[PDB]
Amino acid sequence: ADWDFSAISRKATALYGPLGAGQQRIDAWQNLLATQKQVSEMEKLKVVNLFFNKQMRYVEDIDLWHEVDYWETPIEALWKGAGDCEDYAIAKYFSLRHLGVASDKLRITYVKALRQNRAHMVLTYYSSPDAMPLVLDSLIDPIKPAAERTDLLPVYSFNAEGLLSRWQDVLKKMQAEGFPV
Amino acid sequence: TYFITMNNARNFFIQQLESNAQDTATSLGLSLSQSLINHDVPTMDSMVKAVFDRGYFSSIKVQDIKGKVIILKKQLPQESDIPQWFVNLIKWPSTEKSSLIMDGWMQAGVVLVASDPSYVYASLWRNAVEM
Amino acid sequence: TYFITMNNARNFFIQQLESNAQDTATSLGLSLSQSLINHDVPTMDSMVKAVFDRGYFSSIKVQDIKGKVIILKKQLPQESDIPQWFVNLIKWPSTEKSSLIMDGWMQAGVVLVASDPSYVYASLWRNAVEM
Ligand SMILES: [Ca+2]
Ligand SMILES: [Ca+2]
């Protein structure tokens, strides 16, 4: 399931306009995916989590998209260089899947962020089904065992799937951007 | 070839949408009971988002015992592409199913779930046969 | 006086049932996630039964974190007055929709909700009109 970044850049330019500095960030993403396939799974988690936390500024959807809730594709996140809680999680999810992390190990997790006192979303990694998960977050850079994140309270978790709803709309946008399905 | 009347197709969707809206309202009402007791708006907000983002509902609403709205998730208005005269032939009063949120035997509020008929309208409109 | 073809009705009805199975899986999975309810088998059994009796599913299944089947509710086995030639025109496989059962951050299992295409078979057989 290889990704054609030249065609993706061409299609995204038509969908969103000239990508500007977003093209360089998409180039940096392509480099990450090209050079991190053979490292350990724990290293994949670190470099992907750190890459998007550094490449994206946290800005609310109402400011960036003029919509209360708007789920970015990874290309949209890198085009804008910005997003909010679920945008980080989605971008890290698809990157880790492309790098070979099994889908059974990755969950989209709705949480309560205690310090911000608001609904929040993170990506969780389960080394085995009964394991304590690691939290890939947009609020901080370290990846910690979930129970060590005393500032978070989990609400519900989802295994990402699909082929209209929020996640399906993301997949629809990625198909238009040129990603294989 | 075999057909079914438009009215019979309509009846199936009314049954299935009301059942689905009621089932989510009841099961979500159970899940919301402790965060509502605790007045934990972010957790209630997070639960409704989890169900709403994954489903196809028009709206989910959480009220307290006095009817004051605590959580409201709504679908942005949708464009269609389906004439109103046809919708008038098949439309049914707006579906909204409720379930009480309980603190033991004491009623603590209500959750209200409304289905989204836009799939029903589109399926019947695209494949309607006049005979 | 509008009709829809039986083949198109079959597609709509199956899609609506499969969507309902997903929504029920999500809401039931969330409710079983609360207060370690999924470890209280008598309470979880009562909860799954309530959802099954009100729904139209072929089966609801609960597995724990090790994959052991803990709850399995299935349609009581009733025989069909529907001829095979008619079923062959409309037959479709039953899909199983899932949602996770959680204890906070720890995974506790999965709830599996299966659609029932035989319900569509019976509805179309009752309302089939030949033209
Ligand atoms: Ca958002
Ligand atoms: Ca967003």
Author numbering:
A (entry chain E): 51 to 213, 230 to 247
B (entry chain B), C (entry chain A): 22 to 152
Task: Cite, word for word, the article reporting this structure.
LapD is a c-di-GMP receptor that translates changes in the concentration of this cytosolic second messenger into cell-surface events via an inside-out signaling mechanism that ultimately controls cell adhesion. Specifically, c-di-GMP-bound LapD engages the periplasmic protease LapG through its Per-Arnt-Sim (PAS)-like domain, preventing it from cleaving the cell surface-bound large adhesin LapA, a protein mediating cell adhesion to multiple substrates. In contrast, c-di-GMP-unbound LapD adopts an autoinhibited conformation and loses its affinity for LapG. To address these shortcomings, we report here two structures, that of the output domain of a LapD ortholog from L. pneumophila, also known and referred to here as CdgS9, and that of LapG in complex with the same output domain.
While the homogeneous complexes failed to crystallize thus far despite the best of our efforts, we were successful in determining the structure of L. pneumophila CdgS9Output bound to P. fluorescens LapG (see details in ‘Materials and methods’). The crystallized complex consists of two CdgS9 output domain molecules that adopt a similar parallel dimer conformation as in the apo-CdgS9Output structure. The output domain dimer is bound to one LapG molecule at a lateral docking site, with an interaction surface of 1290 Å2 (with a calculated ΔGint = −16.3 kcal/mol; PISA [Krissinel and Henrick, 2007]) and involving both molecules of the CdgS9Output dimer to a similar extent. As predicted by the biochemical analysis, the conserved tryptophan residue (W126) is the major anchor point on CdgS9 as it inserts into a hydrophobic pocket at the bottom of LapG. While there are contributions from a limited number of hydrogen bonds and a water-mediated interaction, the interface appears to be dominated by hydrophobic contacts and shape-complementarity of the interacting elements. The resulting complex is asymmetric with regard to the output domain dimer, manifested by a 5 Å tilt and vertical offset of one PAS domain fold relative to the other. The central helices α1 are pushed closer together—a movement permitted by smaller residues at the interface (S48 and S52), a perpendicular-to-parallel stacking transition of one of the F33–F34 residue pairs, and the relocation of R75 from the dimer interface to a more surface-exposed position. The net result is a transition from a four-helix bundle with poor shape complementarity with LapG to a two-helix bundle and an overall shape that is able to accommodate LapG. First, we identified a rare di-calcium binding motif in the N-terminal lobe of P. fluorescens LapG, which is in contrast to the single calcium ion bound at the same site in the L. pneumophila LapG structure.
